[model samples]
Target chain A: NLPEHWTDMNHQLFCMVQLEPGQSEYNTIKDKFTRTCSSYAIEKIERIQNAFLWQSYQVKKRQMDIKNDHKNNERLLFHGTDADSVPYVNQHGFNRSCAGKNAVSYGKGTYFAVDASYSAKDTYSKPDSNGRKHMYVVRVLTGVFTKGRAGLVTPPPKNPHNPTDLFDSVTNNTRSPKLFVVFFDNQAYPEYLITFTA
Target chain B: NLPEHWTDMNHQLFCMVQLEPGQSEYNTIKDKFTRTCSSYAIEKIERIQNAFLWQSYQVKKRQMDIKNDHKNNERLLFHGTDADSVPYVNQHGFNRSCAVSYGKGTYFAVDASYSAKDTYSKPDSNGRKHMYVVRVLTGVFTKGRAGLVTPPPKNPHNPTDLFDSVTNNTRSPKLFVVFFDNQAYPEYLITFTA
Candidate 1:
């Protein structure tokens, strides 16, 4: 029913169909990789397949849709990492437990860059033994966001008086956030797997 | 700060962590219960911290995480359990081999209220009940076929191509019937009086 290499992850299915280098989907990401993030040569590009993740994201979006008039605040974001971390992320998806592993200047949660180049760094996407790095083109549900602070594990509640209404995510800036941090697991879907030489 | 269980899955080494008023952890779960099982008055909410059970559940989750086809569609679902079965379910995890409703596997509900019904959660002598917010590996699921001893094949043509779990609804699942005993963890123990 599925490829042997495709493995189970945190109860979510994790598989990716590698894109042909000449295909449009490959080119689309390739162009973005070169233009928005890095001039690194792309070795491989694959489309992530996690039906449960997609469905979970849809469920989250539907909830947001009811509140924001169909504006689920979907954004194409990026998270850079080394090859060793790929399998962990592929199976578990982005989570709050690994918050401090990559970055912590913002709130302690999984960080995503608006610009691919921002995450395509040695600081963010550490290089492997072959000088290659991996990054995820994630579909993030940034329903509502607010400025984040250090040591904050989650986004602040919308109101201090009422601790129930919490912000969907945290950002470096309230107006223009180049980096968005998500605290929830299903709030994001790792859409693509990009392996490139930095 | 985030919820305690979210941050720490392979957990605390104790019987329970009691939640009281004014505590953020307490208030957080208090709100959770109020929304999920509003009618039931919560006498107390204790965070289950059995190291043995937590480790058992964690190992199971890890085993399923790397499955070739299972989506790792782990979710925090609900189970309305009886007091008598609490210790067993906690110690051994959900025995998915039981032929109750969905199939010969453990059942979980998308909604807390659904699990809280008397048909499933038969109240104890004191009219008290327990519900668990369990971590479920609801991976790639098909429909809940009746009288099935084992999971059906993922493909009808191939007998070896089998499904990981079963569901009441394919498009939008309301109930998950998992075949693996370790594919779930009783993350939160909600004690209440109906």
Candidate 2:
């Protein structure tokens, strides 16, 4: 019942019958965001790169009539680190043993937190299991957005720490300051941080 | 460029495209053979019924969708184990921890192991991290058929070790088996047990 290419992706092509200024008949896609940290630099690069290449490959595959499910594009962008000295505190408490840096930023309709998890356990003095572990968590902003609205036009401090202070500091400034905190954990857990975008 | 209904999973319609006899339309799928051994008794109807309903949830997810990229299906499967098993073994090798099991079926491929940097170290035997952990792997015969193919053929052994040289001395069922070994390191070095 569906076209060969779309069927392979579990998707179908729709007939668009109308067009207007800043409005066209098309399928709506849900926004997807992914986090990236400094510790997993290579892995993050590879993952994002794979998604990028996969998208291009899908476009080419469709043009050549290749009925392959591998042609589906589902990539997440790797938003780099945020601005330093923005005074954002850690959602999870801080650890002095960690030697990595973290930051947060927002751009092009998305939020991002780039952090690095590193080995903090001492190999000799306090040599323990804590030193040999390392990880990174990139907090990508995935909040819902309204149509016909300007992107990245928020009231500055979108986090809990100090909304009014952050807003006043960034308003009328050349670059909007984004704050983030980096910390180490024995293991990675989902939802390491939580904040509202009001 | 795509249908709105197709993207709306709740509003989408599903139909199985049965292949015509002698039709060669499908070629992307590979024919895989898997052998399984279960300590859980299958002879009793009650046991079989219970195992299929509860224990077979992982298998069912894989049969429908092995890959769980966001565009496909954003489903997450949560698993927890004691600290001892935190650094568990995956398809790649041992000490491969921090893998996200997010997908539908058995071939639930794992990524970002390199990012996790899971390493092994001698434990003190009495810490919070010294607990036992439950390990999860995908891609089993019970996970069901991915494409239009016959079910995975059954194996003849209950416990693979039961078929030893002393038990089957007259007949040599020299079947191949893969073994993974981990020493003080995190690498999943392979060595045959035959």
Clashes of each: 18, 16
Q: Please give, for residues A1-198, the per-residue lDDT of candidate 1 as tens digits.
A: 332444454454556778888778789888877887656778888788765556455556555555565565888888887776676566556755444454447776788988889878887778888888888998898878889887665567788865435688888898888888876556788878888884
Q: For residues B105-190, what per-residue lDDT tens digits would candidate 1 score against the true structure?
A: 77888887888898767789999888877888776678887665446777767554456678887999889887644567776777
Lowest lDDT 10-residue stretch of candidate 2 chain A: A25-34
Give the Cα RMSD of candidate 1. 15.6
lDDT of 2 by residue, A90-113 (tens): 211111122232222222122222
Q: TM-score each candidate.
A: 0.52, 0.19
Chain A TM-scores, per candidate, are 0.86, 0.18
CA error at residue A132 for candidate 1, angstroms: 1.2
Q: Give the local distance difference test score of model 1.
A: 0.70
- Report the error of model 1 at residue B116, Å: 21
Q: All models: lDDT?
A: 0.70, 0.20
User: Which DockQ-derived CAPRI band holds candidate 2?
Assistant: incorrect
